[PDB]
Amino acid sequence: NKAVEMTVNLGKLARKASWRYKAPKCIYYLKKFIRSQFKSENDILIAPEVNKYIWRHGIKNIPKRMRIKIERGPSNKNPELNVFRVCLVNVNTFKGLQSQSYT
Amino acid sequence: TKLPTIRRIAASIFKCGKNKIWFDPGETPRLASSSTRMQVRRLIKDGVILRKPNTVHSRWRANKRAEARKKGRHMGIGKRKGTKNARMPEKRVWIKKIRGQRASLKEMKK
Amino acid sequence: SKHVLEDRRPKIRSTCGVQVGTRIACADNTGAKIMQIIGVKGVRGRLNRLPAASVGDVVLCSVKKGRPDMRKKIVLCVVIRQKKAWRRRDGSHICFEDNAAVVITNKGDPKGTQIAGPVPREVADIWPKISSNAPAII
Amino acid sequence: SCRKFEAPRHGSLAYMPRRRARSVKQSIRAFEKDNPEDPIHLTAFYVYKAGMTHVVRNKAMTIKEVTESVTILEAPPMVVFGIVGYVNTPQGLKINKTLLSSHINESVLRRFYRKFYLSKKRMFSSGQKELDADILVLKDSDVIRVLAHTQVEKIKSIRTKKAHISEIQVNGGTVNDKVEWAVSMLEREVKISDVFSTNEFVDTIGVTKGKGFQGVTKRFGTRILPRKTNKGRRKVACIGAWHPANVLRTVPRAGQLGFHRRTELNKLIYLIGNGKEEIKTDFDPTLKSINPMGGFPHYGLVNNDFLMVKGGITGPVKRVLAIRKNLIGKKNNENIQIKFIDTSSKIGSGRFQTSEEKRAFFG
Amino acid sequence: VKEGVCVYSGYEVPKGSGLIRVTNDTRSFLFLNKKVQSLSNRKINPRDVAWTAASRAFHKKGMKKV
RNA sequence: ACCAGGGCUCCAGGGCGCGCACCCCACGGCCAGGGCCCACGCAGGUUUGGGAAUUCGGCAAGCUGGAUCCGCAACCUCGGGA
RNA sequence: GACCACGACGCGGCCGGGGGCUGGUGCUGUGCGCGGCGAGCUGCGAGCCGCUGAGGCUUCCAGACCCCUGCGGGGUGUU
Ligand SMILES: [Mg+2]
Ligand SMILES: [Mg+2]
Ligand SMILES: [Mg+2]
Ligand SMILES: [Mg+2]
Ligand SMILES: [Mg+2]
Ligand SMILES: [Mg+2]
Ligand SMILES: [Mg+2]
Ligand SMILES: [Mg+2]
Ligand SMILES: [Mg+2]
Ligand SMILES: [Mg+2]
């Protein structure tokens, strides 16, 4: 049960999104990115602070980078099944930040 | 079924719009049990139901533009879209002129 | 056929900037000021394609304004300048400020005795008699 | 009745039906005419498209400086690992004998598998007592071709270890000496400089850039209908007469454009060099790689032997490309003297030739 | 082998790039690209455009000497 | 028909501006699949050079555009034209 | 992804990949912030200057750096 803290480029994840709907498709491409990164089919719980960060400048002007933190854990609904919780990491700059993992 | 009923009850109590009403998200089973205005007033008193403030429409930029216009800042040729008579009525100028001259002429006569 | 060019010259392939219908300046002192292109000498013709010319190409023109003995007359001229930038043979690109042509005779000699404005090396290579009447060759 | 104004046909019927190519690697459909008084030499090679630049060369006629687009085909040496012999049959050519080497490596047997990672690699488990019997029947052949594969891992920008196998005709004299050369060259690399040389014309065989399903205006260059046109302007309007009561195959219809096999003739080799060594010309005294600043766009850097070919080459970069000698005997009378090679950045429009030239500009 | 120096930016123009605009005064000006040409058509002084060599010479941030 | 239609009357706060025009905000009220975007569309931008050669025809598109100051012809029913 | 409407096609599936980050290469044109000029006005002040060819961006290229990371199902041949 690690906790991966990493920078995602929401520009690069949503290049194939429409400019008109960059924000909701960014949620789609992020959850598709988490599943390909950790090869799993557990649900991704996007924290509302993450979703508020993406829609910060409306639907077209998504921020380029975004530091997140992924917590594998059991589901509060059903503890039989694990789940991903993407939580937002507030950072002042992205220059030089390395992706890390810890428990 | 139940919580939009409370929202218009709390709106008629507050005399505001239903969209200006915030329910406590932790307190929905107490909200779903209450059904009378006496109970919804108790939820307002307990703070479960709040009236949100109105959305900010500040007049800072309008007042900053107004006092700048009083100095004459945005009064140039390129900032006029109505005619001279539309922007300042030629009749209103004459009436202000001739009534001032008529008043002081009488005040000389007295 | 009414306006023959008795000795036809080589053409230099470049981006054709003028066409039939292009109003061009007249650079020499023949008394013509603005001419409109009637046809281009040598053009085989394709379906729906307007015949287009580049610098050094022989062009038929009706003098749209100028001296009264010169106006409303079909004339032979050679395109000497072009607003469209064209790639030279060395691969650089050169653009002139206007579209200009110079009235020539049927033997290929210029009618005017001087040319206002410059000509490029393309007009100098094909028409040494034309570029002699110009001030500078660029 | 007759059409009012005549015009040429839109697009060649020589390339219709415009279908997709069956493969990405194209086999040589025709090698040059084998001359027995010629020395023994290979006739084709398989290269990979890296990118384009332009060179500057002196075009003697007085000397006039001209610049010309070239393209750079990275050519790691090809390993000859088999021989194929042919006989002239009244039905055509027939496989006389196929002789493989005892060694077939992981690159070239990646080609024989669809999913290699899940494979057990048991192809070509394969005796050397039958070599002399297989060489002897191979000496009875009429046409000798070697089986050569490319070394795709040497490029490393193309994420492909799976090799491209092809037959290359051994042209020279006395079929005895053809296979004696060919058994000498088994499991040996053949350089691009051994096959071709500079200022000689070659034919390039490749597959074009795929464009997908395209309409008739891109596929054939038919005229866009006027602005008033209901039901669409990028069409052919009349697709046929009443009689014959079918549509002819000569009518431009919408379909697949690109990813077609193309053979382009008389592509002149300007330079044969290596991607590691730095080129210097007589007129430009700077040692620089053939790789431009920032690498070749969508390719990378050339680290193997490269082929500089005048003009454009069929297909996108990183695609395999067959190159053969021309089937007619066409030599270049001109001698190409390359004055300058533009190694400026093709990302954007770079103005520096080297990164040292950029670092000197900014301090 | 370069084309020359740009008349506006002062940059070195590679061979094959640039445009030689001739202005009917028998004067030829070599411009580097279309960005430079658009500034020159708008009659913008190259000292106003901060990245050109004319402005860095004007602001004296261009260099240090030997 | 939970139909982009039609159907009498009343009530619009702030900014811009001549304007209860447009546009933005407030009040009040709202938000009804997924993925990928080939061709051809429908709707909308931009197209070097040429500039009506297109076409039955400048259709469509484009140019002009508010205001201030200046200047304003033939003609005319003397008012206009403007 | 070099192919592609969908199929198909091309590469690869831990000797692997993806993403970060750094460098390269470009584009834009000198960021926010702090501190000197600034027409004048009785401290305000558009703009300018310096730090700052800065900052933003880079979908292309490189990496010897950081992090993550699975191995399920279907079918058919041979003996
Ligand atoms: Mg009045
Ligand atoms: Mg026609
Ligand atoms: Mg119609
Ligand atoms: Mg490029
Ligand atoms: Mg209002
Ligand atoms: Mg145009
Ligand atoms: Mg017309
Ligand atoms: Mg017509
Ligand atoms: Mg007409
Ligand atoms: Mg109209």
Side-chain angles (χ1 to χ4, degrees), chain A, chain B, chain C, chain D, chain E residues 1-62:
Chain A
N1 277 24
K2 295 180 205 178
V4 184
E5 199 190 71
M6 66 184 190
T7 310
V8 303
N9 198 347
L10 310 176
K12 284 213 210 186
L13 293 183
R15 289 287 162 80
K16 286 199 171 191
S18 185
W19 67 273
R20 191 60 181 84
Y21 308 106
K22 218 74 153 171
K25 276 275 211 168
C26 165
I27 286 292
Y28 165 74
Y29 281 113
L30 181 65
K31 281 165 64 182
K32 192 192 173 186
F33 177 72
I34 295 304
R35 289 165 70 251
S36 68
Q37 197 60 238
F38 322 96
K39 302 293 193 201
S40 185
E41 270 162 298
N42 300 130
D43 311 327
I44 291 95
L45 293 184
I46 293 295
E49 293 86 11
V50 159
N51 173 67
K52 187 159 47 199
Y53 187 92
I54 289 174
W55 292 77
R56 184 167 46 180
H57 303 330
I59 204 178
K60 312 152 187 175
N61 198 10
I62 66 170
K64 308 300 177 185
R65 282 166 224 273
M66 171 197 219
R67 190 83 164 169
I68 57 173
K69 176 188 157 205
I70 300 98
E71 292 143 309
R72 317 198 199 86
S75 153
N76 48 47
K77 180 69 72 176
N78 324 114
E80 295 86 0
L81 308 99
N82 281 115
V83 74
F84 289 116
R85 326 205 180 229
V86 177
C87 275
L88 176 76
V89 172
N90 290 315
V91 285
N92 50 2
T93 176
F94 292 108
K95 289 300 177 181
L97 274 198
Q98 307 299 313
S99 55
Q100 301 152 205
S101 63
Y102 43 86
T103 68
Chain B
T1 55
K2 193 52 163 192
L3 277 189
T5 297
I6 302 299
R7 180 158 263 128
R8 65 141 151 84
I9 286 172
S12 177
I13 290 169
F14 274 134
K15 297 167 173 59
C16 73
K18 301 175 202 193
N19 281 45
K20 293 287 150 161
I21 286 173
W22 172 91
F23 289 150
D24 205 344
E27 208 71 31
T28 77
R30 193 191 307 191
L31 275 157
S33 51
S34 50
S35 66
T36 67
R37 281 166 102 99
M38 189 59 70
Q39 298 178 84
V40 176
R41 284 191 209 111
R42 184 64 177 189
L43 292 179
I44 288 173
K45 181 188 178 305
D46 284 7
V48 179
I49 301 167
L50 295 183
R51 184 188 173 169
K52 290 179 166 186
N54 286 5
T55 310
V56 181
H57 201 317
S58 158
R59 279 194 49 90
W60 183 90
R61 252 176 280 102
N63 288 345
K64 191 212 169 173
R65 188 174 191 102
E67 60 194 5
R69 174 179 253 267
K70 212 144 168 291
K71 297 173 175 66
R73 279 306 104 85
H74 319 277
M75 304 275 292
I77 284 177
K79 282 277 181 272
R80 302 169 198 182
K81 296 192 78 182
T83 67
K84 250 179 184 167
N85 176 279
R87 167 176 278 267
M88 166 57 73
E90 199 176 325
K91 178 147 187 165
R92 192 217 284 166
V93 167
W94 161 253
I95 290 176
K96 177 163 170 42
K97 171 185 154 165
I98 195 47
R99 282 182 191 173
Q101 294 189 355
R102 274 165 183 184
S104 68
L105 267 179
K106 295 176 191 168
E107 198 269 327
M108 288 168 185
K109 193 189 201 178
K110 286 181 202 171
Chain C
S1 178
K2 279 193 182 67
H3 316 264
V4 298
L5 194 66
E6 186 174 359
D7 308 325
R8 186 162 160 178
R9 310 235 178 175
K11 196 175 84 71
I12 288 177
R13 167 198 166 84
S14 59
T15 315
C16 294
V18 303
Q19 287 179 331
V20 160
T22 296
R23 301 228 168 175
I24 52 181
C26 186
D28 59 354
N29 57 320
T30 52
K33 293 320 279 154
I34 287 176
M35 301 181 290
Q36 187 172 1
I37 295 184
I38 280 173
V40 187
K41 221 80 195 179
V43 166
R44 160 205 188 278
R46 194 257 185 274
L47 181 67
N48 291 314
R49 179 185 312 230
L50 317 185
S54 64
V55 311
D57 295 14
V58 186
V59 158
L60 290 94
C61 270
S62 64
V63 185
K64 280 307 181 181
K65 55 186 57 53
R67 281 180 199 166
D69 55 353
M70 211 60 182
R71 289 180 65 247
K72 297 176 200 176
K73 293 192 169 152
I74 307 160
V75 81
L76 263 192
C77 60
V78 164
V79 175
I80 61 148
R81 283 197 291 272
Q82 169 180 119
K83 263 170 75 172
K84 173 65 195 185
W86 75 91
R87 171 201 163 95
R88 288 150 83 83
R89 64 182 67 87
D90 70 284
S92 63
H93 298 71
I94 181 170
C95 173
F96 280 92
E97 202 206 42
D98 57 338
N99 303 321
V102 166
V103 174
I104 58 158
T105 62
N106 286 336
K107 292 174 61 205
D109 297 326
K111 278 208 163 188
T113 67
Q114 63 198 16
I115 289 174
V119 294
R121 266 299 150 194
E122 288 92 326
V123 177
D125 289 357
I126 308 174
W127 315 86
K129 299 290 188 183
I130 287 186
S131 56
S132 298
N133 294 17
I137 300 166
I138 297 192
Chain D
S1 50
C2 191
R3 52 187 309 190
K4 179 171 279 297
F5 295 113
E6 210 71 27
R9 204 212 168 273
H10 289 295
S12 186
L13 288 170
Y15 298 98
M16 297 161 68
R18 313 188 79 99
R19 298 189 159 218
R20 298 173 181 180
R22 290 199 191 176
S23 176
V24 293
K25 190 221 74 183
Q26 303 312 117
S27 301
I28 305 294
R29 275 172 189 166
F31 300 92
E32 77 172 4
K33 196 193 193 306
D34 165 84
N35 186 35
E37 295 79 9
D38 289 15
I40 302 170
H41 60 270
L42 293 186
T43 53
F45 210 88
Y46 273 72
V47 304
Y48 292 89
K49 190 182 179 184
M52 293 185 69
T53 179
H54 61 265
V55 309
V56 167
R57 67 170 190 95
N58 278 129
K59 185 187 182 174
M61 306 183 155
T62 180
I63 316 291
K64 274 207 186 168
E65 179 177 359
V66 66
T67 181
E68 284 156 347
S69 66
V70 304
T71 171
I72 295 158
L73 309 173
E74 180 149 26
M78 272 198 301
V79 183
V80 168
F81 78 110
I83 315 163
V84 188
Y86 288 87
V87 288
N88 288 339
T89 301
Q91 274 73 40
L93 273 178
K94 211 193 179 303
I95 301 292
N96 183 29
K97 172 60 68 177
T98 297
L99 177 65
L100 293 148
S101 73
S102 180
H103 182 269
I104 280 93
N105 55 2
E106 183 266 333
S107 81
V108 68
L109 69 93
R110 254 178 186 270
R111 182 55 63 177
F112 296 96
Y113 286 111
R114 174 71 52 170
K115 283 318 188 314
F116 181 82
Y117 86 107
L118 203 62
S119 173
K120 295 293 179 51
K121 296 101 193 166
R122 286 176 65 95
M123 289 303 113
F124 289 78
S125 298
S126 283
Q128 290 86 31
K129 66 186 77 67
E130 304 98 355
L131 289 176
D132 53 355
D134 273 353
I135 290 164
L136 203 59
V137 63
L138 199 63
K139 269 160 183 196
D140 290 327
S141 295
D142 288 315
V143 174
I144 292 304
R145 303 186 183 160
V146 290
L147 271 175
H149 67 85
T150 60
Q151 295 176 122
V152 198
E153 315 119 315
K154 281 181 165 294
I155 287 177
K156 202 254 177 169
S157 174
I158 319 168
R159 298 304 182 202
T160 301
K161 300 166 183 175
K162 178 188 282 200
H164 291 105
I165 318 167
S166 51
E167 292 176 9
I168 298 167
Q169 190 166 111
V170 176
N171 277 7
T174 177
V175 193
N176 185 274
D177 298 352
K178 284 182 183 184
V179 317
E180 283 188 3
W181 181 85
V183 301
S184 69
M185 290 302 298
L186 290 174
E187 310 165 49
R188 286 186 166 181
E189 303 176 359
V190 173
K191 294 189 155 192
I192 188 63
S193 68
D194 304 335
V195 181
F196 304 115
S197 66
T198 55
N199 55 93
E200 83 179 27
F201 291 93
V202 291
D203 312 321
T204 173
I205 309 181
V207 190
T208 56
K209 287 193 155 185
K211 305 302 197 303
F213 197 94
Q214 287 309 126
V216 310
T217 313
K218 195 180 175 169
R219 214 185 177 209
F220 291 96
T222 70
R223 179 152 274 106
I224 297 189
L225 301 174
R227 190 205 54 87
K228 275 191 171 187
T229 311
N230 195 15
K231 307 163 184 169
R233 302 179 47 182
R234 313 182 99 261
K235 287 171 163 180
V236 297
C238 170
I239 66 162
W242 193 320
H243 278 284
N246 304 319
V247 191
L248 307 197
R249 57 103 186 176
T250 63
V251 176
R253 323 294 304 111
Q256 175 60 240
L257 179 59
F259 206 70
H260 308 310
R261 194 186 205 269
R262 285 301 179 260
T263 298
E264 281 207 316
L265 321 173
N266 311 321
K267 282 295 174 72
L268 189 64
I269 291 177
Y270 271 14
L271 180 58
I272 304 195
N274 185 45
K276 284 294 175 37
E277 66 185 353
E278 287 162 347
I279 309 165
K280 179 254 289 182
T281 69
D282 296 333
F283 312 98
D284 201 13
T286 173
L287 291 173
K288 54 193 186 177
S289 188
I290 197 57
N291 308 299
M293 307 178 53
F296 281 104
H298 299 251
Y299 183 81
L301 311 162
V302 172
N303 309 120
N304 301 95
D305 309 326
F306 70 95
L307 205 72
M308 167 182 288
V309 175
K310 176 198 168 65
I313 281 312
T314 291
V317 301
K318 313 165 155 201
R319 186 170 292 179
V320 74
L321 187 82
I323 288 180
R324 67 170 184 204
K325 309 223 169 192
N326 44 13
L327 312 191
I328 77 165
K330 174 177 193 187
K331 309 262 169 170
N332 190 40
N333 54 50
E334 272 184 311
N335 208 273
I336 299 297
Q337 293 295 108
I338 294 166
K339 179 169 178 178
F340 166 71
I341 295 176
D342 189 278
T343 63
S344 149
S345 159
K346 314 304 178 187
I347 298 298
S349 47
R351 47 163 172 157
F352 317 102
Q353 294 299 115
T354 51
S355 313
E356 292 85 3
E357 190 178 329
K358 177 179 182 175
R359 283 189 257 101
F361 181 76
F362 288 95
Chain E
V1 183
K2 61 170 176 60
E3 185 77 31
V5 197
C6 186
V7 303
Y8 192 93
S9 47
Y11 289 176
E12 272 176 60
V13 186
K15 181 65 179 175
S17 293
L19 177 59
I20 305 175
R21 278 172 146 266
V22 186
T23 180
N24 287 156
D25 317 316
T26 62
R27 286 204 293 159
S28 66
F29 300 98
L30 173 65
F31 296 95
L32 170 68
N33 44 43
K34 189 209 163 188
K35 152 156 94 168
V36 157
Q37 275 168 58
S38 184
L39 292 173
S40 178
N41 292 325
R42 286 159 57 198
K43 305 215 186 314
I44 291 175
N45 201 45
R47 287 172 276 154
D48 281 353
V49 186
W51 46 266
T52 74
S55 71
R56 295 185 47 89
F58 178 77
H59 289 238
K60 284 148 183 46
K61 284 173 303 197

